[PDB]
CSV table of C-alpha atoms in Angstrom, one decimal:
chain,number,residue,atom,x,y,z
A,1,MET,CA,6.0,-13.0,1.8
A,2,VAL,CA,6.0,-8.9,3.2
A,3,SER,CA,3.9,-8.5,6.1
A,4,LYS,CA,2.0,-6.2,6.5
A,5,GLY,CA,4.3,-4.1,8.8
A,6,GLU,CA,6.7,-4.1,5.8
A,7,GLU,CA,4.2,-2.7,3.5
A,8,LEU,CA,3.5,0.0,5.2
A,9,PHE,CA,7.4,1.6,4.8
A,10,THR,CA,8.4,-0.3,1.1
A,11,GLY,CA,7.9,3.9,-0.1
A,12,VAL,CA,8.6,7.8,1.7
A,13,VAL,CA,6.5,8.2,4.6
A,14,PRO,CA,5.6,12.0,6.0
A,15,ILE,CA,6.6,12.0,9.4
A,16,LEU,CA,5.5,14.0,12.8
A,17,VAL,CA,7.0,14.9,15.4
A,18,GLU,CA,5.6,15.9,18.8
A,19,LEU,CA,8.1,16.8,21.8
A,20,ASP,CA,6.5,18.0,24.9
A,21,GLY,CA,10.0,18.3,28.3
A,22,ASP,CA,10.1,19.8,31.4
A,23,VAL,CA,13.9,20.2,32.4
A,24,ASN,CA,14.7,21.2,35.9
A,25,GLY,CA,11.4,23.2,35.6
A,26,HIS,CA,12.5,24.8,32.0
A,27,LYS,CA,9.2,23.9,30.7
A,28,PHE,CA,8.6,24.3,26.4
A,29,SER,CA,7.8,21.9,23.1
A,30,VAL,CA,8.8,21.2,20.0
A,31,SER,CA,7.4,20.1,16.5
A,32,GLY,CA,9.0,17.7,13.3
A,33,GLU,CA,8.1,17.2,10.3
A,34,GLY,CA,9.8,15.4,7.3
A,35,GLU,CA,10.5,11.9,5.7
A,36,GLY,CA,11.1,8.8,6.3
A,37,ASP,CA,13.1,6.4,3.9
A,38,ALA,CA,13.6,2.9,4.7
A,39,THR,CA,14.4,1.0,1.9
A,40,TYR,CA,18.1,4.0,2.5
A,41,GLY,CA,17.2,4.1,6.3
A,42,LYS,CA,16.8,8.1,5.4
A,43,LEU,CA,15.2,10.3,7.6
A,44,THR,CA,15.0,14.2,6.8
A,45,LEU,CA,13.5,16.4,9.4
A,46,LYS,CA,13.2,19.7,10.5
A,47,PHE,CA,12.1,20.6,14.5
A,48,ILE,CA,11.2,23.8,15.8
A,49,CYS,CA,10.9,25.1,19.1
A,50,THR,CA,7.3,26.3,19.2
A,51,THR,CA,8.2,28.0,22.9
A,52,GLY,CA,10.9,30.1,22.7
A,53,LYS,CA,14.4,29.2,23.1
A,54,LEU,CA,15.6,25.3,23.3
A,55,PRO,CA,16.0,25.4,27.0
A,56,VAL,CA,18.9,22.4,26.2
A,57,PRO,CA,20.9,21.9,23.2
A,58,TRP,CA,19.2,20.6,20.0
A,59,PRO,CA,22.0,17.7,19.9
A,60,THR,CA,21.0,16.3,23.3
A,61,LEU,CA,17.3,15.7,22.2
A,62,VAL,CA,18.5,13.6,19.1
A,63,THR,CA,18.9,10.2,19.9
A,64,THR,CA,15.1,11.2,21.2
A,65,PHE,CA,13.6,12.2,17.4
A,67,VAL,CA,11.2,6.6,14.6
A,68,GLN,CA,13.8,3.0,14.2
A,69,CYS,CA,11.2,1.7,12.2
A,70,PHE,CA,12.7,3.7,9.7
A,71,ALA,CA,15.9,1.7,9.6
A,72,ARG,CA,17.1,0.1,6.6
A,73,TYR,CA,16.5,-3.6,7.7
A,74,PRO,CA,18.2,-5.5,4.8
A,75,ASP,CA,16.7,-9.0,3.5
A,76,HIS,CA,19.1,-11.2,4.9
A,77,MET,CA,17.0,-9.0,8.5
A,78,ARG,CA,14.2,-8.7,8.1
A,79,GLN,CA,12.9,-11.9,10.3
A,80,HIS,CA,15.0,-9.3,13.2
A,81,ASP,CA,13.0,-6.3,12.6
A,82,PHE,CA,11.3,-5.4,15.8
A,83,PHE,CA,9.8,-1.6,15.2
A,84,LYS,CA,7.8,-2.1,11.7
A,85,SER,CA,6.3,-5.4,12.9
A,86,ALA,CA,4.7,-3.4,15.5
A,87,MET,CA,2.9,-1.4,13.0
A,88,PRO,CA,0.6,0.0,12.1
A,89,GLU,CA,-0.9,-0.9,16.0
A,90,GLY,CA,3.2,0.6,17.1
A,91,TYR,CA,5.2,0.3,20.4
A,92,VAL,CA,5.9,2.4,22.7
A,93,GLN,CA,10.1,3.4,23.2
A,94,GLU,CA,11.2,4.4,26.6
A,95,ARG,CA,14.8,5.7,28.0
A,96,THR,CA,16.7,6.8,30.3
A,97,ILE,CA,19.3,9.1,29.2
A,98,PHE,CA,22.4,9.7,32.1
A,99,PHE,CA,24.7,12.7,31.4
A,100,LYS,CA,28.4,11.7,33.0
A,101,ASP,CA,28.4,13.9,35.7
A,102,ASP,CA,25.2,15.9,35.5
A,103,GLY,CA,21.2,15.2,35.4
A,104,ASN,CA,18.9,12.9,33.6
A,105,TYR,CA,16.5,12.7,30.9
A,106,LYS,CA,13.5,9.9,30.6
A,107,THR,CA,11.5,9.3,27.8
A,108,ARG,CA,8.4,7.9,26.7
A,109,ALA,CA,7.6,8.0,22.9
A,110,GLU,CA,4.7,6.3,21.3
A,111,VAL,CA,5.4,5.4,17.9
A,112,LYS,CA,2.2,4.6,15.7
A,113,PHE,CA,0.4,5.6,12.5
A,114,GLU,CA,-2.1,7.6,12.4
A,115,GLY,CA,-3.4,7.2,8.6
A,116,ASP,CA,-0.2,7.8,5.9
A,117,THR,CA,1.7,9.2,8.4
A,118,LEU,CA,4.1,8.0,11.4
A,119,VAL,CA,4.0,9.9,14.4
A,120,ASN,CA,6.6,9.9,17.0
A,121,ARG,CA,4.9,11.6,20.2
A,122,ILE,CA,6.8,12.5,23.3
A,123,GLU,CA,7.2,13.1,26.6
A,124,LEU,CA,10.3,13.8,28.3
A,125,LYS,CA,11.0,14.6,31.8
A,126,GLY,CA,14.7,15.6,33.0
A,127,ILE,CA,15.6,16.0,36.1
A,128,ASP,CA,18.8,17.0,38.7
A,129,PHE,CA,20.8,18.9,36.2
A,130,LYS,CA,23.6,21.9,37.2
A,131,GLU,CA,21.6,25.0,36.0
A,132,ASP,CA,25.8,26.8,34.8
A,133,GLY,CA,26.4,22.5,33.3
A,134,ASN,CA,26.8,22.0,29.6
A,135,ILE,CA,23.2,20.7,28.5
A,136,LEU,CA,21.3,23.9,31.0
A,137,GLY,CA,24.6,26.3,29.9
A,138,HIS,CA,24.7,25.7,26.1
A,139,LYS,CA,28.1,24.5,26.4
A,140,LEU,CA,27.7,21.8,23.3
A,141,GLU,CA,28.5,22.0,20.1
A,142,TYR,CA,26.1,21.5,17.7
A,143,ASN,CA,27.5,18.7,15.4
A,144,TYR,CA,27.4,14.8,16.1
A,145,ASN,CA,29.0,11.4,15.8
A,146,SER,CA,28.9,8.1,14.1
A,147,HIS,CA,27.6,5.1,16.7
A,148,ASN,CA,26.3,1.8,16.5
A,149,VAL,CA,23.5,1.0,18.6
A,150,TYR,CA,23.0,-3.3,20.0
A,151,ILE,CA,19.9,-4.4,20.8
A,152,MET,CA,18.3,-7.5,22.1
A,153,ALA,CA,15.7,-9.3,23.3
A,154,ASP,CA,13.3,-9.2,25.8
A,155,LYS,CA,11.2,-11.9,25.1
A,156,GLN,CA,9.9,-12.1,28.7
A,157,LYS,CA,8.8,-8.3,28.0
A,158,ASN,CA,7.4,-9.1,24.4
A,159,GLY,CA,10.0,-6.6,22.9
A,160,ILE,CA,13.3,-5.5,22.7
A,161,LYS,CA,16.5,-3.9,25.0
A,162,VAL,CA,19.1,-1.2,24.0
A,163,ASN,CA,22.1,0.2,25.3
A,164,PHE,CA,24.6,2.9,23.9
A,165,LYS,CA,26.6,5.9,24.7
A,166,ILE,CA,26.7,9.9,23.1
A,167,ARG,CA,29.7,11.5,23.7
A,168,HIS,CA,28.7,14.8,22.7
A,169,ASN,CA,31.6,17.0,21.9
A,170,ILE,CA,32.1,20.5,24.0
A,171,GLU,CA,33.2,23.5,23.3
A,172,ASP,CA,36.7,22.8,25.1
A,173,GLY,CA,37.6,20.2,23.0
A,174,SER,CA,36.5,17.8,25.6
A,175,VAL,CA,32.7,15.4,25.8
A,176,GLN,CA,29.4,15.1,27.9
A,177,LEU,CA,28.9,11.1,27.8
A,178,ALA,CA,25.3,10.3,27.4
A,179,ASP,CA,24.8,7.1,28.4
A,180,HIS,CA,21.1,5.5,26.8
A,181,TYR,CA,19.2,2.9,28.0
A,182,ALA,CA,16.1,2.0,26.0
A,183,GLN,CA,12.8,-0.6,26.3
A,184,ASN,CA,10.8,-0.5,23.2
A,185,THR,CA,7.0,-2.4,23.9
A,186,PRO,CA,3.8,-3.1,20.8
A,187,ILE,CA,1.0,-1.7,22.0
A,188,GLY,CA,-1.0,-3.5,20.1
A,189,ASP,CA,-1.6,-7.6,21.4
A,190,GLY,CA,-0.6,-9.1,18.4
A,191,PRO,CA,2.7,-10.9,17.4
A,192,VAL,CA,5.7,-9.0,16.7
A,193,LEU,CA,9.6,-9.8,15.7
A,194,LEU,CA,11.6,-10.6,18.4
A,195,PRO,CA,15.2,-10.7,17.2
A,196,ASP,CA,18.8,-12.2,17.5
A,197,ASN,CA,21.4,-9.9,18.7
A,198,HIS,CA,22.5,-7.4,16.5
A,199,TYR,CA,23.2,-3.7,15.8
A,200,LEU,CA,22.1,0.0,14.2
A,201,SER,CA,24.5,1.7,12.6
A,202,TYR,CA,23.9,5.5,12.4
A,203,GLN,CA,25.3,8.8,11.2
A,204,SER,CA,23.7,11.9,11.9
A,205,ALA,CA,23.7,15.3,10.0
A,206,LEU,CA,22.4,19.0,11.8
A,207,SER,CA,22.1,22.2,10.0
A,208,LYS,CA,20.6,25.4,10.0
A,209,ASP,CA,17.6,26.6,7.6
A,210,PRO,CA,19.0,29.3,6.9
A,211,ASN,CA,15.4,31.1,6.0
A,212,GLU,CA,13.9,29.7,9.6
A,213,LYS,CA,13.9,32.7,12.4
A,214,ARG,CA,13.0,30.6,15.1
A,215,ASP,CA,14.5,27.7,17.2
A,216,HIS,CA,15.3,24.5,15.7
A,217,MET,CA,17.4,21.8,14.1
A,218,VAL,CA,17.8,19.9,10.5
A,219,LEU,CA,18.3,16.3,10.8
A,220,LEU,CA,19.3,14.7,8.7
A,221,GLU,CA,20.2,10.9,10.0
A,222,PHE,CA,20.4,7.3,8.1
A,223,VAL,CA,20.3,3.6,10.0
A,224,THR,CA,21.4,0.8,9.1
A,225,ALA,CA,20.7,-3.0,10.3
A,226,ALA,CA,23.8,-5.2,10.2
A,227,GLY,CA,25.3,-7.9,12.8
A,228,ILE,CA,23.8,-11.0,11.7
A,229,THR,CA,26.0,-12.5,8.6
A,234,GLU,CA,28.8,-18.8,3.4
A,235,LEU,CA,27.3,-18.4,0.1
A,236,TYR,CA,31.3,-16.4,-1.3
């Protein structure tokens, strides 16, 4: 049988992203729009800094900017926490530790508002070096592919996730961003608590040649795997 949560994602869904941020007192806001196609695990989003120049590098916000759009193949349909929490939604909390620099703490509420899937985020960053790789804008505008490891936290009626991003610094080096996350349902209804598995990510960053505001165009694909004889 197809669950309610699953059914909400059977076609293309419009997405709205909202972020209010404050990094070392540098305040900024971002809005994003686009759409998600969970059948293909496909996100197409464009973000605008509505407060002027973004005070951190766009790539450092990629992971923050809707895991309900991951492609869960049929055989893994019992392990899709994210869709099972819909439409009421879930809250994602992360801490992102930038090695030898500051940290971001984020809280994102992911829920439907009518037909639109909303990702509403508050981001707080502290302890950054004002001339470091983040506040000094020394990161390249590119992105690596990654696997992301998901485990149940049954005790907390949710999931925990940990992974590493390795941002490319303009000198050929690496700025590690260690991610730790918890996702919890907003509502009181049952959710699917998964066996251990992972999500496989690829991300491409680009620019709109007709856009004069500070912005990022993101194309991202996300597929679940790690659970698998018929052959």
